[PDB]
Design a protein around this motif. Sequence first.
Motif, PDB file in Angstrom:
ATOM      1  N   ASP A 173       2.310   4.298  -6.328  1.00 29.72           N
ATOM      2  CA  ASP A 173       1.342   3.805  -5.358  1.00 29.72           C
ATOM      3  C   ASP A 173       0.483   2.755  -6.034  1.00 29.72           C
ATOM      4  O   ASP A 173       0.062   2.908  -7.192  1.00 29.72           O
ATOM      5  CB  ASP A 173       0.440   4.933  -4.866  1.00 29.72           C
ATOM      6  N   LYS A 174       0.200   1.698  -5.289  1.00 30.51           N
ATOM      7  CA  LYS A 174      -0.596   0.604  -5.813  1.00 30.51           C
ATOM      8  C   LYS A 174      -2.073   0.993  -5.918  1.00 30.51           C
ATOM      9  O   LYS A 174      -2.717   0.682  -6.909  1.00 30.51           O
ATOM     10  CB  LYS A 174      -0.407  -0.643  -4.949  1.00 30.51           C
ATOM     11  N   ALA A 175      -2.601   1.679  -4.905  1.00 29.26           N
ATOM     12  CA  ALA A 175      -4.013   2.063  -4.894  1.00 29.26           C
ATOM     13  C   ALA A 175      -4.153   3.530  -4.559  1.00 29.26           C
ATOM     14  O   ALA A 175      -4.587   3.888  -3.468  1.00 29.26           O
ATOM     15  CB  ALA A 175      -4.783   1.209  -3.896  1.00 29.26           C
ATOM     16  N   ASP A 218     -15.590   4.558  -5.896  1.00 26.13           N
ATOM     17  CA  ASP A 218     -14.357   5.367  -5.874  1.00 26.13           C
ATOM     18  C   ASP A 218     -13.413   4.973  -7.016  1.00 26.13           C
ATOM     19  O   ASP A 218     -13.559   3.915  -7.643  1.00 26.13           O
ATOM     20  CB  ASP A 218     -13.641   5.284  -4.518  1.00 26.13           C
ATOM     21  N   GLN A 276       4.094   3.383  -1.272  1.00 23.52           N
ATOM     22  CA  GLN A 276       4.585   3.501  -2.631  1.00 23.52           C
ATOM     23  C   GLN A 276       5.934   2.839  -2.812  1.00 23.52           C
ATOM     24  O   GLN A 276       6.738   2.780  -1.881  1.00 23.52           O
ATOM     25  CB  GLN A 276       4.701   4.962  -3.066  1.00 23.52           C
ATOM     26  N   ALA A 282       0.836  -1.212   0.000  1.00 28.12           N
ATOM     27  CA  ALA A 282       0.000   0.000   0.000  1.00 28.12           C
ATOM     28  C   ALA A 282       0.872   1.263   0.000  1.00 28.12           C
ATOM     29  O   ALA A 282       0.507   2.264  -0.617  1.00 28.12           O
ATOM     30  CB  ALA A 282      -0.945   0.002   1.199  1.00 28.12           C
ATOM     31  N   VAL A 311      -0.994   3.906 -15.637  1.00 28.36           N
ATOM     32  CA  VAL A 311      -1.644   2.855 -14.832  1.00 28.36           C
ATOM     33  C   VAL A 311      -1.344   1.446 -15.383  1.00 28.36           C
ATOM     34  O   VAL A 311      -1.140   1.277 -16.589  1.00 28.36           O
ATOM     35  CB  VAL A 311      -3.168   3.135 -14.707  1.00 28.36           C
ATOM     36  N   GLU A 312      -1.304   0.458 -14.477  1.00 34.22           N
ATOM     37  CA  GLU A 312      -0.966  -0.963 -14.766  1.00 34.22           C
ATOM     38  C   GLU A 312      -1.714  -1.594 -15.948  1.00 34.22           C
ATOM     39  O   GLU A 312      -1.120  -2.005 -16.953  1.00 34.22           O
ATOM     40  CB  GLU A 312      -1.248  -1.807 -13.500  1.00 34.22           C
ATOM     41  N   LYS A 351      -9.650   4.295  -7.618  1.00 39.39           N
ATOM     42  CA  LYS A 351      -8.387   3.990  -6.941  1.00 39.39           C
ATOM     43  C   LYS A 351      -7.560   3.062  -7.830  1.00 39.39           C
ATOM     44  O   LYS A 351      -7.915   1.900  -8.018  1.00 39.39           O
ATOM     45  CB  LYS A 351      -8.657   3.373  -5.560  1.00 39.39           C
ATOM     46  N   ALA A 352      -6.470   3.593  -8.388  1.00 35.75           N
ATOM     47  CA  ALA A 352      -5.659   2.891  -9.393  1.00 35.75           C
ATOM     48  C   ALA A 352      -4.190   2.767  -9.003  1.00 35.75           C
ATOM     49  O   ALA A 352      -3.722   3.364  -8.029  1.00 35.75           O
ATOM     50  CB  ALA A 352      -5.776   3.583 -10.747  1.00 35.75           C
ATOM     51  N   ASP A 353      -3.489   1.956  -9.790  1.00 36.32           N
ATOM     52  CA  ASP A 353      -2.062   1.706  -9.640  1.00 36.32           C
ATOM     53  C   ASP A 353      -1.355   2.578 -10.651  1.00 36.32           C
ATOM     54  O   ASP A 353      -1.354   2.272 -11.853  1.00 36.32           O
ATOM     55  CB  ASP A 353      -1.742   0.232  -9.905  1.00 36.32           C
ATOM     56  N   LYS A 369      -5.916   6.714  -4.373  1.00 34.47           N
ATOM     57  CA  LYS A 369      -7.242   7.286  -4.491  1.00 34.47           C
ATOM     58  C   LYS A 369      -7.138   8.514  -5.368  1.00 34.47           C
ATOM     59  O   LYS A 369      -6.230   9.325  -5.211  1.00 34.47           O
ATOM     60  CB  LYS A 369      -7.860   7.670  -3.142  1.00 34.47           C
TER      61      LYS A 369
END
Length: 319
Positions: free
Chosen positions: A165-167, A181, A140, A138, A215-216, A183-185, A169
């Motif tokens: 950061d993995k998630a 919401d 970074q 969680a 993003v992933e 919330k991305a990687d 917001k």
Amino acid sequence: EILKSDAGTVDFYGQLRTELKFLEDKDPTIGSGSSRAGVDANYTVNDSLALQGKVEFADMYVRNHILGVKTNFGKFSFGKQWTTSDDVYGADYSYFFGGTGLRYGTLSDALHDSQVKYVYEADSFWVKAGYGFPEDNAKQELAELYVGATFGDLAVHAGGGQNRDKAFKVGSNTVGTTTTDIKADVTNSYFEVTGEYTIGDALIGVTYYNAELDVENNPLVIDEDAISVAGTYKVADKTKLYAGYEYVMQEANTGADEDGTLVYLGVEYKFASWARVYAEYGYGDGTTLGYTNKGSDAEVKATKVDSANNFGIGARYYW
């Protein structure tokens, strides 16, 4: 500052501030906010080989948690800390509103927690670097490396880093009656070059900063390309003028072209070496994907804005 010593001093220090911001189309806000206080230690053992235990507070939270080892060449400090790129920063000389040119803190508050930082100095030439253990994940992924030097009046520094950061917001969206919401990687991929030109009373900084986020599991590119110019004229011995011009443009891979400009202008009277006021005026316009004003620690969320005026006054008390 200092208390007991022999081979090692015991700093105790802090900065009572009082800041009044006047952002556009909101109420005036006040506060001792950004005020802080902390205690640092030191202790040499052999040769050049020593420690420091810095620990800060600011609703008493913890801004720093340093447990650091001065060594026979460099220094290695482990704990909660500012990012290396926030120590290195760039050409924002503002107390309240600038810092938009600097794209390391797009995700990471400039403030990762299980970090370890390498500082090596000698000469003018220094090399700073930093790593973050993403304990939990969680937290970074963070890695930063920075070089610098100075050649008489011109003080140059380059570096960069990547931040993920993995998630992270972003925000909400409502399906009439179903608030999901967002919330991305996501990954901040930044590199910067700066110069600072010191010419008697004057100072001129220019900072070039490139960044990229993506993003992933997603087709997505955002090319932050940034510039800052600014400077300080020392108009008295006690007083000091400052202003600055920041500009960032954001190229979407999917066509979308946005940007945004910040002009600060202000002044800093230094009553003594523990007192100072500062009055500042920011004009802005256009998009930012969020930033951090190092001076005031005023950590701003990603946002889009109009031609708007903002004023900032505030004083400090150091000890």
